[PDB]
């Protein structure tokens, strides 16, 4: 047992929910107790979606346990299909249902529905939300994706964008712009916006843009084996990383890198004398691996901060984070325990924290400037306005976001000699 107050990630069944909710025409059925529908509110309230998530629970409770639990699951699968007529379905267990001995694969096969029902294996006691998403998406791609002739024009798939993803909406929009300027169109963006039938047509793309390793890595590897599609290893967050990404895409496709830099303003903002006070400001960085790695490079090489701590809560990204941290002369903090993040922050004594909503509150407690760079996030970090982290507009956004919490040059000079 572990005494727990805050968790960076939910159970893996929430990751499954955010693949299903990202997609259209797919119904996810979770074998779970009455009460677990609380997770629907994540989508309707934080992301403020205008429809109920395409997820239903078998809803077992004290008066229908034992042999009834298997029946409730059967009914839930049947009722979801009859009502919604999805192109495909997924079935999975909640943490409580994992302690039961019902077989969702055998139950779903005996029902013999006219569409695919993809069973999911989500270990709730050892794995978490991000794995849930990655494995659900992988299981669905392995069930539906098929070798095809390439599109006549150079196209890619976008992989890894989900419901409840930090700036997934606008990152998709911004990355699509980056590729279009190079004459590359998107075939399928998945899971976000995609149907099961779209997943069937994934193989006609020339390559894949792996937007978020935590939610797309496994499906990217399968598509590389099944569809012989290279996938990008560089995540275009930051000006440098966006350039490396485009050079990577160029190597994959043989197309020249073309950019539209008419609204790229971050480099000049950072080069201007307004920003010289930012030099050597000590920054602690925490969140998921993808966003922490990206932030550290921007911090050190684009904004001129001294990176004084780097860590992530998802140990699936521990390898690349350890590799990244070493470039800064740092050992990576790999932990899901916020108290250990708090200790590390206090020890590093930074001037700025870049992290999660939890680090926002640690920073408040310590009286320290903080900006959000990563999920978990509250409703404010699901904005109405265009707010990408990726590409050139994302660099603009990130500059404004990070310098905001910091008192300015003049103020600093008045708070020392006066």
């Amino acid at each position: 047992m572990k005494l727990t107050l805050w968790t960076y990630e939910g159970p893996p069944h929430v990751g499954a929910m955010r693949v299903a909710t990202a997609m259209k025409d797919l119904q996810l059925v979770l074998h779970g107790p009455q009460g677990d529908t609380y997770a629907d509110l994540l989508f309707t309230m934080i992301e403020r979606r205008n429809a109920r998530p395409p997820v239903s629970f078998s809803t077992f409770e004290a008066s229908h346990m034992g042999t009834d639990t298997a029946i409730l699951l059967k009914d839930a699968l049947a009722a979801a299909h009859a009502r919604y007529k999805p192109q495909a379905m997924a079935v999975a267990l909640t943490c409580t249902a994992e302690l039961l001995q019902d077989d969702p694969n055998g139950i779903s096969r005996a029902l013999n529905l006219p569409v695919p029902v993809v069973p999911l294996e989500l270990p709730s006691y050892s794995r978490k939300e991000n794995y849930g998403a990655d494995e659900t998406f992988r299981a669905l791609v392995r069930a539906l994706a098929v070798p095809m002739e390439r599109t006549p024009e150079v196209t890619c798939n976008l992989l890894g964008a989900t419901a409840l993803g930090f700036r997934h909406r606008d990152d998709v929009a911004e990355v699509t712009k980056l590729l279009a300027t190079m004459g590359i169109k998107v075939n399928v963006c998945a899971p976000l916006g995609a149907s099961p039938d779209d997943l069937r047509k994934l193989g006609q793309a020339h390559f894949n843009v792996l937007m978020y390793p935590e939610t797309g890595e496994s499906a990217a590897r399968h598509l590389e084996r099944a569809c012989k599609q290279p996938f990008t290893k560089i995540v275009p967050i930051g000006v440098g990383a966006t350039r490396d990404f485009l050079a990577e895409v160029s190597k994959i496709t043989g197309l020249p890198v073309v950019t539209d830099e008419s609204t790229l303003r971050q480099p000049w903002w950072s080069a201007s004398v307004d920003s010289t006070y930012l030099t050597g400001k000590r920054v602690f960085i925490f969140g998921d691996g993808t966003h922490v790695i990206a932030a550290a490079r921007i911090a050190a090489k684009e904004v001129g901060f001294e990176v004084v701590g780097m860590g992530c809560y998802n140990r699936e990204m521990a390898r690349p984070l350890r590799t990244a941290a070493a470039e800064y002369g740092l050992e990576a903090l790999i932990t899901d325990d916020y108290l250990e993040v708090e200790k590390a922050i206090e020890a590093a004594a930074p001037e700025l924290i870049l992290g999660t909503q939890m680090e926002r509150n640690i920073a408040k407690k310590l009286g320290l400037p903080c900006a959000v760079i990563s999920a978990p996030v509250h409703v404010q970090d699901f904005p109405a306005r265009y707010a990408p982290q990726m590409g050139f507009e994302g660099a603009n956004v990130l500059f404004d976001t990070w310098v905001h919490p910091l008192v300015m040059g003049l103020e600093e000079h008045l708070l020392t000699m006066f």
Partner: protein
């Protein structure tokens, strides 16, 4: 025209969209100052509490989850000495906790963790500084507010005995509401009066064969039963919502304690006219409007009764997760007789009925609210009714305002 005593209630089951009783910890921990609520459950249960708590989670709250690891599931794994280690460590650094609640969840129950046994073992190990209790807040057993019921009920066998003829008011109310209630009953000459739960562990009420208790919240069936086992007698009353609800609730206590009609009417006249006038500010927007309530908390019947009788609303279907017939009898006698009553839920069938009714205002949860708004249905999110001072005279206007607000916003934004 009024009265649903003999109305057939639809007993419906199937897919439900409700909270487990764990969510009750969110308000319970604020009321009960020297208590700690330790859920034994999974990451799912900690995830729920964190999501529910929002800002509170960062204010070092008096709750936590002992989350089950893969190792705790094993048939030789001594999860009980693991649990004892967990609470010993928790209490070691927290000498402020005088009451520890071991809260059962779906995983702990399916696993068959005997938390009752643990509570007795642990309160023996940690006497006399901390008493430890056990109750269920699992989705298997409880819905939303029922977690308050199972909590209070667990405390009852432990309460001091007394021969005293005192009043217990049952239900965790906001401090301001509790003070107003306590003031009005003192003004009527009834006393002394105590609350279950109390603000601190050392001032809990005693119970005995001469104890009277009245419920301030409808969801308190198990606590009612537990108190009655100690020999205490209940005062039946409609719930203290609105001017009428509050008068009837006060009158029941007044009649119980031999309070004269002259004194009741004199203590009560000014607060009553004040409440009735505060409600009238919301009548133009609310009158004639049809009302639909999805099940969440058991406040549906008494709030529907207040909205029809004091706000001129028209009931359609009023649904509740559980309908305690004896406790709800006074409010049911006052509900408009046209009202379709539902206990439980089959979500899709119930949404189908909702759709065909096309009601002007729908009370529902946060999972349904935005989806329903998007289909053109004005909603009033149900959680607010447990998270706002709404009981008694002074808050009667505010209560009406909770329902008029979404209708006024809709008008203001659509012209």
């Amino acid at each position: 025209t009024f009265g649903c005593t003999d109305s057939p209630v639809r007993r419906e089951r199937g897919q439900k969209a409700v909270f487990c009783g764990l969510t009750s910890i969110v308000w319970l921990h604020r009321k009960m100052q020297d208590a700690f609520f330790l859920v034994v459950g999974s990451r799912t249960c900690a995830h729920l509490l964190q999501a529910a708590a929002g800002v509170m989670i960062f204010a070092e709250p008096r709750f936590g989850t002992a989350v089950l690891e893969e190792q705790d599931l094993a048939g030789l794994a001594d999860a009980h000495k693991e649990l004892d280690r967990e609470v010993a460590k928790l209490l070691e650094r927290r000498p402020d906790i005088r009451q520890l609640f071991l809260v059962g969840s779906c995983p702990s129950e399916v696993l068959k963790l005997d938390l009752d046994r643990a509570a007795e073992r642990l309160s023996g190990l940690h006497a006399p500084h901390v008493r430890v209790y056990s109750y269920t807040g699992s989705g298997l057993d409880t819905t939303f507010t029922q977690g308050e019921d199972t909590c209070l009920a667990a405390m009852v066998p432990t309460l001091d005995t007394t021969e005293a003829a005192e009043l217990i008011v049952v239900g965790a109310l906001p401090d301001v509401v509790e003070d107003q209630c306590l003031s009005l009953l003192t003004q009527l000459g009834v006393g002394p009066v105590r609350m279950l739960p109390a603000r601190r562990s050392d001032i809990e009420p005693a119970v005995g064969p001469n104890t009277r208790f009245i419920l301030a919240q409808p969801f308190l069936g198990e606590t009612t039963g537990a108190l009655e086992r100690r020999g205490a007698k209940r005062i039946a009353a409609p719930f203290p919502f609105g001017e009428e609800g509050t008068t009837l609730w006060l009158k029941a206590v007044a009649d119980a304690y031999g309070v004269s009609a002259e004194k009741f009417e004199a203590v009560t006249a000014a607060p009553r006219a004040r409440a009735k006038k505060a409600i009238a500010a919301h009548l133009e927007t609310l009158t004639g409007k049809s009302l639909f309530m999805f099940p969440d908390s058991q406040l549906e019947i008494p709030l529907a009764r207040f909205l029809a009788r004091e706000c001129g609303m028209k009931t359609t279907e009023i649904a509740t997760p559980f309908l305690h017939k004896a406790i709800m009898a006074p409010d049911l006698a006052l509900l408009p007789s046209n009202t379709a009553l539902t206990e439980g839920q089959d979500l899709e069938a119930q949404l189908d009925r909702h759709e065909a009714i096309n009601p002007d205002l729908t009370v529902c949860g946060l999972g349904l609210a935005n989806p329903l708004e998007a289909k053109g249905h004005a909603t009033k999110w149900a959680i607010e009714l447990v998270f706002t001072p709404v009981h008694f005279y002074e808050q009667a206007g505010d209560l009406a305002g909770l329902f008029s607000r979404p209708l006024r916003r809709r008008a203001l934004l659509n012209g």
